[PDB]
Structures are given as structure tokens and as C-alpha cells.
Design a protein around this ligand. Sequence first.
Ligand SMILES: CC(C)(C)c1cc(CCc2ccccn2)cc(-c2ccc(S(=O)(=O)CCO)cc2)c1
Length: 233
Amino acid sequence: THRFVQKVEEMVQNHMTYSLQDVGANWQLVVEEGEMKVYRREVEENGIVLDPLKATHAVKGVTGHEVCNYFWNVDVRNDWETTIENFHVVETLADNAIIIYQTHKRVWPASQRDVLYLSVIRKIPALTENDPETWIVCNFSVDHDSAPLNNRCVRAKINVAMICQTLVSPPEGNQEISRDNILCKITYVANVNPGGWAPASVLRAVAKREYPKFLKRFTSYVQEKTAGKPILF
Ligand SMILES: CC(C)(C)c1cc(CCc2ccccn2)cc(-c2ccc(S(=O)(=O)CCO)cc2)c1
């Protein structure tokens, strides 16, 4: 156990309840690239862009467990992440939960941002014998007494989740499932609070360009790293 067990439960359950809904007009579809659909709502609070982002995608030949492991595992973070300048693991809470501090590349003309968040990976059992199991990574801001002092940075706050359900062809008697017959259905949600002044059109343009690039690059990277390796369901 650790002091955030209840908090992690609430944040994960909130995603399972609300984030997995189909978007079916309050979500604007902003970018479509094949099976990748990126939606957003335009929201500003006390002057600053909060725009909730939600994306679906469908990735052949990887499992949700694999996607979530690659997304969570700090040891491969630098192989796919292109927005971070530095990260530091502040605290380990469990084999599946850590607290990370990171600084991002500056988005001109706004100040550089930093972020301090708990990152957790969980498997959520099928709601009924008829539903898929879900693997989820949730990255959500927390406070911490060993927060770094970084005067060049404004502190952003995030609530992100990478949510995956995996569909397979069943095994034909004594024969494994091939990666050809697996499909990972992703819902990715990102609620980022810049934590201070930033110009709305720039944030919007950057989100619209960079989220699709991120999803494409990260999902390709998982396919590339898992090709020809045993499936980890
Ligand atoms: C422009 C905007 C899209 C809002 C934005 C700006 C910045 C840079 C820091 C920042 C935030 C706000 C304003 C200025 N700079 C970071 C993020 C962000 C952070 C973390 C995650 S994650 O999925 O946990 C890793 C994804 O690669 C995703 C996106 C988004």
C-alpha cells in the first residue's frame, strides 16, 4: 500500500466511466488519419486554454498490455518521447506506480513548463464476462515535498490516460495467436492545464499538429519493438 492508493483508484475509475464513452457534436473531430481520430473541446478557464483532447486509434499486431508497458516504462521514455527536456523519478510508490518530475521543450512565446505527476499502470478486469479487459496508464498531477525548484518553468497540471482494449482471433485448438490477428483499440485522453498565461491560438495549433504526430510515432514504435517477439497479452 501507499498513500495514493485511493486517489489512483478514483482517477482510474473516472477514466473507465467517462473517458471510454463513444464521442457520438460536443466533441469536435479535428484531425483524422486512417483509424486515428483526434477530437477536442475548446475550453478556457480564467483566461487560459484547457481544451480536453480525446483520440481513438486501432493498432494492428500489438496488445494493450504491450502499449501500456511501453507508455509507462521510464526506461524507454527517451526512445519515443520528443517533448521532454529532462525527467527525474521523484518517488517509487509500487511496482506499478511512480511520481515523475519533467521539464518540457518551450512552446514559444510562452514560458517553459514543468510537471509533477503520478504515473500508474493497471489492468482493469472485464466489467462482465462479455466485455474486454482493459489496460490503462494514467498520468495525473500531484503535489510533492521534494518538488524541484526551477525558476525558468511555470508548473502545468495534467491528467492523461492511455486506455487499451485488445481484440483477438480465438486460438484454433493447440495453436498460438499470431500478431496478424490481434488489434489494440486505444482511447487516449489528455487534459493539460498550462498553469499560467499562454496564447490560445498557439496552444491550439501545437495540439492539432503534435498530438497526431505523437500517437503515430508512439504506436509505430510499439509495433516496431514488438515485431518478431512473443506476444505479451
Ligand atoms: C500544447 C499542449 C498540447 C497543451 C502541450 C504542451 C506541452 C509542453 C508544456 C506546456 C504545456 C502548456 C503550455 C505550454 N507548454 C506538453 C503537453 C503534454 C504533456 C504530457 C503528455 S503524455 O501523453 O503524458 C506524453 C505525450 O507525449 C502529453 C502532452 C501538451
